[PDB]
């Protein structure tokens, strides 16, 4: 069997510049390579077969190269909405050997995160649950650090993190920090403070509460 | 163009047999076999085998042959795959691609999928939850509202700020799994003049057991 192999498995450049992406096989498989683009939640789409022939219609901007073994799609203009996988696939013998994709992230300008912190709500604490929620928002890069600390002290389970993958639109990030506790959990407590460690300060950005009105 | 549709999403667990299908629209089903590729979150995308939607012959990556059995409903100019005697191992998102040629070494066009969970989990429809602000300035002219849904099984779940019609600012994040079920947060920055002034709404279906939810955020504040 062929063996596509790809590395890097992350690129990134900025908006309107050029990259490149190696997808070397195990043998010469004679131009015979395909490539293509899946964007995060789509199908895959045929970029170009024979290492250089443009499907209908992808742009003149999406360029196919290689040879013997070795291959390369370069695209350039990288616009925004650049960012998927890319994956290339022998077509020289049966069976068409993928190989593993290379993701594009856009590298932009820096992005201080945007975070909100979120009460436990009534209603699930009549269910005898608390949640307090943090939302980190459309930061930029991608290296968010989020503890939480009950009371002052890190409180380092029931947390779940969950991550916005890289916005089509403006290149950046999002984050979530769910972090789960019982009524009589919560109710023992009283000041509730994420943290955020991020590159964008020194000073780490903190969102913290308990209530009152408004 | 060419505009292959796929099954909705399957649960099933170990030991059963699933029915995945792809309806051809837009070419003459038979002079281009079907191709179906799995994507795994893992290895990346990984070919099954063709069919050639002519005479009826398949062809099966080694992995394959024996549990997987590629079909057609040549008059409805559908393709099916069909996983028997599932395996946790095959919880993954499928494919059938268009052979562009003779054994599909090319796919041109491919449909939009089909995921299957194989697990043994309870449907257990979610609790839905309006999470709305204490106080404080939100970055600047705006607030943040959220929702959390919380308890549901399996993965999809559609949510929705006020019908669809509010779009810009949402951030839904993915759903993550806590052992039996999954937890999903959305985030939706208004303008100060917006809320409570406008009606901000979590409208959430949970298809998988015919939930549908619309927490308003009362201000609460």
């Known amino acids: 069997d062929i063996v596509m192999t790809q590395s890097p498995k992350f690129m990134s450049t900025s908006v309107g510049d050029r990259v490149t992406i190696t997808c070397k096989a195990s043998?010469?498989?004679?131009?015979?390579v395909v490539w293509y683009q899946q964007k995060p939640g789509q199908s895959p789409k045929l970029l170009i077969y024979?290492?250089?022939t443009r499907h209908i219609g992808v742009p003149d901007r999406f360029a196919g190269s290689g040879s013997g073994t070795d291959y390369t799609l370069t695209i350039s203009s990288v616009q925004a909405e650049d960012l998927a996988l890319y994956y290339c696939?022998?077509?020289?013998?049966?069976?068409?050997?993928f190989g593993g994709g290379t993701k594009l992230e856009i590298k932009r300008a820096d992005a201080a995160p945007t975070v909100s912190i979120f009460p436990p709500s009534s209603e699930q604490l009549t269910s005898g649950g608390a949640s307090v929620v943090c939302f980190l928002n459309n930061f930029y890069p991608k290296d968010i650090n989020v503890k939480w600390k009950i009371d002052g002290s890190e409180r380092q389970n029931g947390v779940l993190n969950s991550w916005t993958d890289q916005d089509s639109k403006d290149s950046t990030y999002s984050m979530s920090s769910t972090l789960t506790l019982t009524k009589d959990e919560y109710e023992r407590h009283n000041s509730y403070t994420c943290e955020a460690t991020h590159k964008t300060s020194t000073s780490p950005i903190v969102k913290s509460f308990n209530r009152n009105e408004c | 163009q060419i505009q292959l549709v796929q099954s909705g999403p399957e649960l099933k667990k170990p030991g059963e047999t699933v029915k995945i299908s792809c309806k051809a629209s837009?070419?003459?089903?038979?002079?281009?076999?079907m191709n179906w590729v799995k994507q795994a979150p893992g290895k990346g995308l990984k070919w099954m085998g063709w069919?050639?939607?002519?005479?009826?012959?398949?062809t099966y990556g080694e992995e394959f042959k024996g549990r997987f059995a590629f079909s057609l409903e040549t008059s409805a100019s559908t393709a099916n795959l069909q996983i028997n005697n599932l395996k946790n191992e095959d919880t993954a998102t499928f494919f059938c691609?268009?052979?562009?040629?003779?054994?599909?070494?090319?796919?041109?066009?491919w449909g939009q999928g089909t995921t299957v969970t194989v697990s043994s989990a309870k449907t257990t429809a979610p609790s839905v939850y309006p999470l709305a602000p204490v106080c404080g300035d939100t970055t600047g002219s705006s607030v943040t509202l959220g929702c959390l849904v919380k308890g549901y099984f399996p993965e999809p779940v559609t949510l929705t700020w006020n019908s669809g019609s509010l779009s810009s600012g949402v951030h839904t994040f993915p759903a993550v799994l806590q052992s039996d079920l999954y937890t999903l947060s959305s985030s939706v920055t208004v303008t100060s003049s917006t809320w409570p002034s406008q009606s901000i709404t979590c409208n959430v279906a949970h298809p998988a057991s015919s939930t549908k939810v619309d927490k308003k955020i009362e201000p609460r504040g």
């Open positions: 024979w290492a250089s």
């Open positions: 043998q010469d498989v004679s131009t015979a």
């Open positions: 069919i050639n939607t002519n005479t009826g012959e398949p």
């Open positions: 837009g070419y003459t089903f038979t002079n281009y076999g």
């Open positions: 696939q022998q077509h020289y013998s049966p069976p068409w050997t």
């Open positions: 691609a268009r052979g562009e040629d003779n054994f599909g070494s090319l796919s041109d066009y």
